[PDB]
Amino acid sequence: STTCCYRFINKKIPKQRLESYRRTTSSHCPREAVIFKTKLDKEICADPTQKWVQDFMKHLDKK
Amino acid sequence: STTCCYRFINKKIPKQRLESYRRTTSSHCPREAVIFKTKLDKEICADPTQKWVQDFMKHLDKK
Amino acid sequence: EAAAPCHSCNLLDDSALPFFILTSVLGILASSTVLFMLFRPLFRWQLCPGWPVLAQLAVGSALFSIVVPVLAPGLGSTRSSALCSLGYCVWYGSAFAQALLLGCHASLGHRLGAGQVPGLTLGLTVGIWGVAALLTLPVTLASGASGGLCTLIYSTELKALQATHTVACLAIFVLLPLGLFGAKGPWMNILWAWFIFWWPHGVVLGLDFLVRSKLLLLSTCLAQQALDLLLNLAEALAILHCVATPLLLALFCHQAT
Amino acid sequence: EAAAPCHSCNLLDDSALPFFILTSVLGILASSTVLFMLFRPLFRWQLCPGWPVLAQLAVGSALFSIVVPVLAPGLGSTRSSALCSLGYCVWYGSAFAQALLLGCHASLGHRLGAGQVPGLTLGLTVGIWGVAALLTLPVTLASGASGGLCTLIYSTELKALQATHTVACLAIFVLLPLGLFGAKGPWMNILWAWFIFWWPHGVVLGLDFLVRSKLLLLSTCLAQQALDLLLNLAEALAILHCVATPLLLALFCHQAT
């Protein structure tokens, strides 16, 4: 609980390696980030400000 | 009980006709007064600023 | 020369013990009845609009009924200033609490229109009872016993505390109702009969303040006798509140349904 | 490159149900015991100086002990916002009331030395409880159930309310004791354990206000972990208050005799 990401990174990521996507809860969190779940069952947080991550969200099925 | 009088008079009084002494409770009352009780079943209030009442207060047995 | 000193009419004194004891018993009975016909939901009292406010008004009337006899005259000695202070404190606290609850239900009816809002209702009731317990500080500080009877205190220094108490009483009891009606009949639903039982207790309290402060003066004996009679009549019209209010609540609830 | 999202320690949640339920039960038991050991004067508890303030501290502890489990986690859903608001309101009101009784006693022991003054004691207790019920208005307005569990509300339309609540908590819990301990071994009475218990809940609330209002910003995941660890530790040190206060009261009573 109280998930947060203080060190969000805007680097590019592979598209196929992911498995699911999630939003954040900025209750106690500093500057906002996003949560994505990889196919390797490893969670990750990244900077949503970049254009590459925006294209990643656009390409996400999300349905 | 709870006795007042608005128009106390400072005339003379019969020396031998008095019976007892009393004082008033100025709670709701105008100008402070004093209650004199007489032997003929008459109770009267008088102006305490006169000299006659000053004489009567000391001439009262009060003992 | 008659010049007879004026003796107080002193109506409500000991010989009027019934109007204290029987009134207290009937009031506590009626208040407990109207409260426990609310606390048992089998009588179809659940769907009433803003029923917790009605329950708070009823429990205030209850507490007032319980406090009635402790400060009433007729009983002899062995009463201390502690009991008189308790009596006046919870007496006027119940009065203030009921008046404030009516003010809330009159001004904030639109807020209650959204149903039973939990946070809003809880904050309103807790703040209303807190401020009612706060407003009764001057009366509970300026209260005592003179041989056993409970009377307010008008000393050479307590004039400030009693002045605060009487301006609060004037506000709550006569400025608040008229102020709600001051929009210068259709409005003022039937429950404004609550303030009819304290409007005299506001006006006469103000007049008593002015008289005790020695700033005014009593011109005639008839004036003093009429002042005493008005004070006692207002006290009676305030004591009958204990039985009056729950019946008004019941009439409202069974007429608005 | 890990870049893994940070996760909280999250101690107090469901797996710690005993620390709520058993603590509340022991608190109500002990508080009721020390309450009816005063309500029954057969145990020579009437010779104490200023016993009604002691009993009011005890009854505040009893109310807090009773209220503990309603806002406690571990229980499932169906907890309405009404019950959660009730829990926060009366919990923080009890805390404020006890702190105010302590502040009153530590400063007016001189007045209490004149014995059991009826008017003074009654006015003090009624005003203190009224202002305590008044001070819990911001927390009871800014309360809710997020999915059925009790959390405070920090939102744009509640910023002013939560700021007032947190400044009041800061005052009552850390500025009031240290204020009494100003005048720049210990000399004052031993009952500072109350404010020692509520001191973490006073200091951490300001940091929570600063962080939750976006004024400050955290550095790393270690800072966040330390923050919520301190928050949970302060909550535990404020919840053990149920069992803390009555035992200290009894020790004080049986040591000054």
From Swiss-Prot, chains A, B:
Record has DNA repair as a keyword: no
Function, as annotated: Chemotactic factor that attracts monocytes and eosinophils, but not neutrophils. Augments monocyte anti-tumor activity. Also induces the release of gelatinase B. This protein can bind heparin. Binds to CCR1, CCR2 and CCR3.
Subunit structure comment from the entry: Monomer. Interacts with TNFAIP6 (via Link domain).
Entry's family note: Belongs to the intercrine beta (chemokine CC) family.
Compartments reported by the entry: Secreted
Protein's name in the database: C-C motif chemokine 7
Residues of the full protein shown: 31 to 93 of 99
Disulfide bonds: C4-C29, C5-C45
Protein's GO biological process: antimicrobial humoral immune response mediated by antimicrobial peptide; cell-cell signaling; cellular response to ethanol; chemokine-mediated signaling pathway; chemotaxis; cytoskeleton organization; eosinophil chemotaxis; inflammatory response
Molecular function terms, GO-annotated: CCR chemokine receptor binding; CCR1 chemokine receptor binding; CCR2 chemokine receptor binding; chemokine activity; heparin binding
Entry keyword Disulfide bond: yes
Modification after translation (UniProt): O-glycosylated.
Name of the gene this protein is made from: CCL7
Gene Ontology CC annotations of this record: extracellular region; extracellular space
Keywords in alphabetical order: Chemotaxis, Cytokine, Disulfide bond, Glycoprotein, Heparin-binding, Inflammatory response, Pyrrolidone carboxylic acid, Secreted, Signal
Swiss-Prot record, chains C, D:
GO MF entries: C-C chemokine binding; G protein-coupled receptor activity; signaling receptor activity; transmembrane signaling receptor activity
Cysteines engaged in disulfide bonds, as pairs: C6-C221, C84-C150
Keywords: Blood group antigen, Disulfide bond, Endosome, G-protein coupled receptor, Glycoprotein, Membrane, Receptor, Sulfation, Transducer, Transmembrane, Transmembrane helix
TM ranges: 19-39, 51-71, 85-108, 122-142, 163-183, 190-210, 233-253
Record topological domains on the Cytoplasmic side: 40-50, 109-121
Cellular localisation: Early endosome; Recycling endosome; Membrane
Tissue specificity of this protein: Found in adult kidney, adult spleen, bone marrow and fetal liver. In particular, it is expressed along postcapillary venules throughout the body, except in the adult liver. Erythroid cells and postcapillary venule endothelium are the principle tissues expressing duffy. Fy(-A-B) individuals do not express duffy in the bone marrow, however they do, in postcapillary venule endothelium.
GO process terms (BP): chemokine-mediated signaling pathway; defense response; inflammatory response; regulation of chemokine production
Topological category with respect to the lipid bilayer: Multi-pass membrane protein
GO cellular-component term (any): early endosome
Extracellular side, ranges: 72-84, 143-162, 211-232
Impact noted for substituting R44C: Antigen Fy(x)
Its job: Atypical chemokine receptor that controls chemokine levels and localization via high-affinity chemokine binding that is uncoupled from classic ligand-driven signal transduction cascades, resulting instead in chemokine sequestration, degradation, or transcytosis. Also known as interceptor (internalizing receptor) or chemokine-scavenging receptor or chemokine decoy receptor. Has a promiscuous chemokine-binding profile, interacting with inflammatory chemokines of both the CXC and the CC subfamilies but not with homeostatic chemokines.
Miscellaneous field: A subset of erythroblasts from genotypically Duffy-negative individuals transiently expresses ACKR1 during terminal erythroid differentiation and P.vivax merozoites can invade these ACKR1-expressing Duffy-negative erythroblasts.
Quaternary organization: (Microbial infection) Interacts (via N-terminal extracellular domain) with Plasmodium vivax Duffy receptor (PVDR) (via PvRII region). (Microbial infection) Interacts (via N-terminal extracellular domain) with Plasmodium knowlesi Duffy receptor alpha form (DBPalpha) (via region II).
Annotated family: Belongs to the G-protein coupled receptor 1 family. Atypical chemokine receptor subfamily.
Protein name stated in the entry: Atypical chemokine receptor 1
Higher taxonomy: Eukaryota, Metazoa, Chordata, Craniata, Vertebrata
